[PDB]
From Swiss-Prot, chain A:
Species this chain originates from: Homo sapiens (Human)
Cellular location(s): Nucleus; Nucleus speckle
Tissues expressed in: Widely expressed.
Record: disease: Retinitis pigmentosa 13: A retinal dystrophy belonging to the group of pigmentary retinopathies. Retinitis pigmentosa is characterized by retinal pigment deposits visible on fundus examination and primary loss of rod photoreceptor cells followed by secondary loss of cone photoreceptors. Patients typically have night vision blindness and loss of midperipheral visual field. As their condition progresses, they lose their far peripheral visual field and eventually central vision as well.
Span within the parent record: 1218 to 1265 of 2335
Comment field on protein domains: The MPN (JAB/Mov34) domain mediates interaction with TSSC4 and SNRNP200. Has structural similarity with deubiquitinating enzymes, but lacks the residues that would bind the catalytic metal ion.
Function: Plays a role in pre-mRNA splicing as core component of precatalytic, catalytic and postcatalytic spliceosomal complexes, both of the predominant U2-type spliceosome and the minor U12-type spliceosome. Functions as a scaffold that mediates the ordered assembly of spliceosomal proteins and snRNAs. Required for the assembly of the U4/U6-U5 tri-snRNP complex, a building block of the spliceosome. Functions as a scaffold that positions spliceosomal U2, U5 and U6 snRNAs at splice sites on pre-mRNA substrates, so that splicing can occur. Interacts with both the 5' and the 3' splice site.
Residues forming coiled coils: none
Gene, per the UniProt record: PRPF8
Protein name: Pre-mRNA-processing-splicing factor 8
Curated annotation (Swiss-Prot), chain B:
Its job: Plays a role in pre-mRNA splicing as component of the U5 snRNP and U4/U6-U5 tri-snRNP complexes that are involved in spliceosome assembly, and as component of the precatalytic spliceosome (spliceosome B complex).
Chain's gene name: TXNL4A
Posttranslational mods: The disulfide bond seen in structures determined by X-ray crystallography and NMR is not essential for protein folding and function.
InterPro entries: Dim1 (IPR004123), Thioredoxin-like_sf (IPR036249)
Protein family (similarity comment): Belongs to the DIM1 family.
Protein species of origin: Homo sapiens (Human)
Coiled-coil regions, chain positions: none
Name of this protein: Thioredoxin-like protein 4A
SUPFAM superfamilies: Thioredoxin-like (SSF52833)
Modified residues (Phosphoserine): 131
Swiss-Prot record, chain D:
Entry GO MF terms: identical protein binding; protein-macromolecule adaptor activity; ribonucleoprotein complex binding; RNA binding; snRNP binding; U4 snRNA binding; U4atac snRNA binding
Known function: Involved in pre-mRNA splicing as component of the spliceosome. Required for the assembly of the U4/U5/U6 tri-snRNP complex, one of the building blocks of the spliceosome.
One GO location term (cellular component): MLL1 complex
Tissues where this protein is expressed: Ubiquitously expressed.
Keyword Thylakoid: no
Name of the molecule in the record: U4/U6 small nuclear ribonucleoprotein Prp31
Main location: nucleus
Post-translational modification: Phosphorylated by PRP4K during spliceosome assembly.
Origin superkingdom: Eukaryota
Motif (Nuclear localization signal (NLS)): 295-308
A Gene Ontology BP annotation from the UniProt entry: ribonucleoprotein complex localization
Location of this fragment in the whole protein: 52 to 432 of 499
Amino acid sequence: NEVTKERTAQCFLRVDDESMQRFHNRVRQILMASGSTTFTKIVNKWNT
Amino acid sequence: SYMLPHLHNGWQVDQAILSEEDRVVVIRFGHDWDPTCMKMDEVLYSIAEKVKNFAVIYLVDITEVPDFNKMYELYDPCTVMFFFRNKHIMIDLGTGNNNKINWAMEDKQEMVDIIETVYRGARKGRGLVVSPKDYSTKYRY
Amino acid sequence: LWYEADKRRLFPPWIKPADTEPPPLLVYKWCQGINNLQDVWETSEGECNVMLESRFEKMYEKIDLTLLNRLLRLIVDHNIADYMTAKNNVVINYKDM
Amino acid sequence: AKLWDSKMFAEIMMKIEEYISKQAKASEVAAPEYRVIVDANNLTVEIENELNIIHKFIRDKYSKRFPELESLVPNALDYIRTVKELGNSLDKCKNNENLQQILTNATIMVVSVTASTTQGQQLSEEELERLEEACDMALELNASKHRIYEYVESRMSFIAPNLSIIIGASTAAKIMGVAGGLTNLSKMPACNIMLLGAQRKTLSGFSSTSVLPHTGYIYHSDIVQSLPPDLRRKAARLVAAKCTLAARVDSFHESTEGKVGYELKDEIERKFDKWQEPPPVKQVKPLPAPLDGQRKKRGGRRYRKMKERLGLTEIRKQANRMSFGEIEEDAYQEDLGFSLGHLGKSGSGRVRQTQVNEATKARISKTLQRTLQKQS
RNA sequence: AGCUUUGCGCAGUGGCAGUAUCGUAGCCAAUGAGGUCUAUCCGAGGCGCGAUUAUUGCUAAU
């Protein structure tokens, strides 16, 4: 609380289902798009 | 399926293998009424004109021609065999069997890929060629 | 357009889909702003907070071009707005159709 | 005031023409029939030459109440009808049925939005004895124009048999009345005959292609509209060309039985069903066979330039080298796995920076540069 | 007598581009090809197909 400088609330953070599903779909489309891609290309996409 | 030329007796398929020297003979052994055989007998339709230069496709019903079942192991529902200058061109897939494609696929580019690879390896004079794609899985995920 | 709309304060502070604040810092600022209110966490009288999170459904598709041109002529001269709304009206082409 | 007195002589002439046309309905049941068409065409030209000035007067007088509506409603008669309907108070635009019969819904909404933000002020009662009088005489002149339109359309079965069959007598009348007569348009190129009655419709925040640009009565004729929208322009050019070919014939009154008109119609229909003919048989060439061992090739300045374009530039070849056992900070956050290797690396390489090459500079095509020249 | 303009030929020197050249006993075309600005204006080729190492030859190595 900026006016009083005291811990008055508590914000619990979480990743929503939409973001988890989007990341899972991204990994899926990385994996399925691996007909001839090198291992390095796949892992670079994974790290990114 | 029905559009591609058909072979009726044992002599005709041997002649079709022998009556060509500068292309590859891709024979689809099986039953054209099979759901599996009809899945890829339309892929072979969609590329018959494209591969005219280096491939000719004949269809054979093993019931109509019960002469190659025992020798070439015609007991899977659908089989594809490649012949070059009267020589069965072995092809190394991801699957254990390296003499045939005993499953019907879906993409019209990969079959031309395999046929052109077979032709390329047969002009050199090999007996076993290596497919580009690996079929030890289905890449599904 | 963006440089001018920043030089002259066109977009108000509440419209920050993407401001100088990154989205996580946007979340932090928004939460701290909720907390910083005078009596936000007080309910003795029986008051209550409510919070609505929605989105304008099919906002992009339901934009009438002529009305958009009329709204755009307010902030920019007529020629540029006409160029915008003419650019929006254009043939979309797929493989065949 | 002056315009109303000017139309008085034109009003008397129009009454005389009405008496002649009513008699034409009885005489056709020493003052020949063709002259009753020629003088009527002159009279309709004159009533148009008065409609334009009365529309200008209306725009000048009504600009005090609403100075933007003329820029939004281009067509004259539409402007007179709109200023007659809206009146001084513009609150009569919401769900107004008679506005719809004149204006497109899009332009209805644009003029309503402009009516919301108006800097014009209300008009006095004196302005309402001028503007409404002018609107009434404008509607009267339009009624006279249509009442002679029907007569001219009926009589082009005789006055211009060749032109009245290619396009139909209705559009034939619409294109001969506005052109100033058959003799006038006979001196007119087909390119200009296309733009006969081509309204400069105000694009309502749309692509200029959407609101037909450079479109004339010939483009709105029944013959061209039968064709798909893509071929209409190509059809409009041809039909207007054959229209002027028949017009030059009809000006001097040859082939009154329509032999040249029928020939031109036959040519138009032949071109039309040639354009609509389905595409022919196209062979699907097979893919080329895999190549053999070796083939002899030529070499010279062209091959040298090909080797220069595709050659490994020193900056390119330096980027391929990727060092060994030297972690580097991941450049290009948005996509890692893009490391420049020895390019700009302290591991190895030249002391001086690898200078950029000029042969690899991006270049535009010849035809695209031609498009750039023409566009500018 | 020279000077000089324009088109078409023959060669010569040099520059530049190879995502482009070429064919048209295929079709249409100044009786209008084709039109984005500017359209009572503009106004010459366009389309479809075929050849192709994105014009084609030799010599030269391997």
